[PDB]
Design a protein around this ligand. Structure first.
Ligand code: GJ8
Ligand code: GJ8
Lengths: 191, 191
């Protein structure tokens, strides 16, 4: 639609500059519509970023749902690698939306609440799998599962997103998946 | 001095509202000086937060230097707990400066560079200790030490600061030290 064109324009421009430096007029021009026509689709450029983030977050969530329904046939190291890889590939394929969406957590209650809702969901799912591993005798009962899950999820948020943004310091993007898998597997299966 | 009074006023006000909602006039009034007298001590309210952050960061750094010079007489779990505790206690004793200083990373190159410099230093020291543990045969050679150190340091930044801010999600403050120690010890000593 024109909606999909505004979203694509926003994602393209965000690869060059922050949302602060993008105007409604910029988004309209790229989508081949006028400013008032823009306001028919979105109330604000902040609504455009919220929608972009919502789509990327739901893409990751559905990928993880897909894996949870269809468990891959592998050792525990590859089970966790496959789950972390959802986030690495999904967010790493949308770096500009990731960077801008994280930055908007500071200024938008709707972005903060979106991020908070899905992090809670991914932590609860992490904990449920760690608890399943403990129930079947493959993982030791150490930390409370939900506390362990929370810190591992927060580690992944900061570490993946520092890598994608090329922050100093950061793990290089080509090393970050193996880095996180090591810490997940040792902390989940380690006495 | 009047300098110390401005710094104390800023830290007190930051416990109530963001730097965005604090004026130079607010800082002058609390310190018992006029606005132009304020500008004799600091160029801007942003300089006041930079100085507060610089003092808290250097306090943590010196505490860690103190431990590095005078190694406590304990098992490896208590060695790592004592190091992480520097950050938990130092930043956890200055939550308002922590929150505001992290938020200012987005808008101030000097705050971003301060934070980046010390994180590099703390990661290099982490890696140097992991490498010492590997050299003496107490830790296995798994991940490259500096990559492991980077992800553990970034985990601590996000997890400690989410706890202090009471974010949803977060580990409760009373559980966060034990949570992080578990993940450091298992990931550093785990095959
Ligand atoms: O990174 C994460 N969070 C942070 C997100 C960020 F960074 F902020 F973007 C994150 C990583 C992994 C999981 C997860 C849960 S359970 C599992 C195992 N795979 S599984 O059960 O789906 C599976 C995989 C393969 C075979 C069988 C089951 N992996 C959840 C969250
Ligand atoms: O949390 C950290 N970083 C993130 C900071 C944040 F969160 F962003 F604020 C952080 C935690 C621990 C260390 C560290 C290095 S080495 C050691 C062992 N203790 S030691 O060598 O100093 C020691 C202790 C006791 C006995 C002997 C030696 N601990 C470094 C950094």
């Amino acid at each position: 639609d024109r909606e999909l064109a505004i979203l694509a324009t926003a994602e393209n421009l965000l690869e060059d500059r922050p949302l602060a430096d993008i105007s409604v007029d910029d988004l309209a021009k790229g989508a081949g519509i006028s400013r008032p026509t823009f306001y028919f689709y979105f109330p604000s450029k902040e609504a455009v970023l919220l929608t972009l983030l919502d789509r990327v977050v739901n893409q990751a969530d559905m990928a993880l749902q897909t894996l949870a329904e269809n468990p891959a046939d592998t050792d525990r190291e590859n089970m966790w690698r496959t789950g972390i890889n959802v986030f690495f590939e999904t967010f790493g394929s949308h770096k500009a939306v990731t960077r801008a969406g994280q930055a908007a957590r500071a200024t938008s209650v709707e972005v903060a609440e979106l991020w908070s809702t899905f992090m809670q969901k991914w932590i609860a799912y992490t904990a449920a799998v760690i608890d399943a591993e403990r129930d079947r005798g493959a993982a030791p009962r150490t930390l409370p599962a939900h506390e362990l899950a929370t810190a591992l999820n927060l580690m992944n948020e900061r570490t993946l997103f520092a890598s994608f943004a090329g922050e100093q310091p950061s793990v290089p993007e080509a090393r970050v998946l193996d880095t996180l898998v090591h810490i997940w597997v040792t902390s989940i299966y380690g006495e």
